[PDB]
Amino acid sequence: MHHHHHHMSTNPPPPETSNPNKPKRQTNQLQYLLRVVLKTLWKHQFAWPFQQPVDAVKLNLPDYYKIIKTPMDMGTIKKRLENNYYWNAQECIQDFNTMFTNCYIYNKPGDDIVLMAEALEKLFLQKINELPT
Numbered sequence: 001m002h003h004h005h006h007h008m009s010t011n012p013p014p015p016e017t018s019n020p021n022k023p024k025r026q027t028n029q030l031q032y033l034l035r036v037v038l039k040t041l042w043k044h045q046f047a048w049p050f051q052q053p054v055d056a057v058k059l060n061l062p063d064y065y066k067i068i069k070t071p072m073d074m075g076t077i078k079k080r081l082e083n084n085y086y087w088n089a090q091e092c093i094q095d096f097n098t099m100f101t102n103c104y105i106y107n108k109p110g111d112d113i114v115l116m117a118e119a120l121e122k123l124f125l126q127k128i129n130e131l132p133t
């Protein structure tokens with residue numbers, strides 16, 4: 001008997017950051033989402049949990065990907081913006097929304113990580129209220 005000792009927890013593959021068959025565009029709004037919105041959130045005190053795909057193995061969260069089925073993070077968003085992956089600003093905004101919502105689903109009000117997400121979401125909303133064009 002192996003007693004399943006070899007069945008260790010793993011992370012899923014990360015979201016794609018390039019897809020040659022997906023239509024994309026460089027718009028002023030998308031350039032702004034990278035240069036201003038993402039880059040200022042990236043420098044924030046609370047950016048660190050969100051700068052890369054959730055590493056459920058490192059964080060000892062083996063239930064994370066049992067609960068969260070559409071993972072998203074600012075590292076993925078940053079690469080998508082730099083690689084010119086998006087067609088429009090709303091597609092990128094959707095990824096930010098998924099990132100924040102995933103955090104609120106997996107965690108509970110009052111958790112340190114939720115307070116971090118709440119603060120970043122407030123800055124995000126402030127920065128995207130007005131976009132170029």
Ligand code: NA
Nearest residue numbers: 057058059060
């Ligand atoms: Na671990």
Ligand code: NA
Nearest residue numbers: 030084085086
């Ligand atoms: Na893009």
Ligand code: NA
Nearest residue numbers: 127128130131
């Ligand atoms: Na703005």
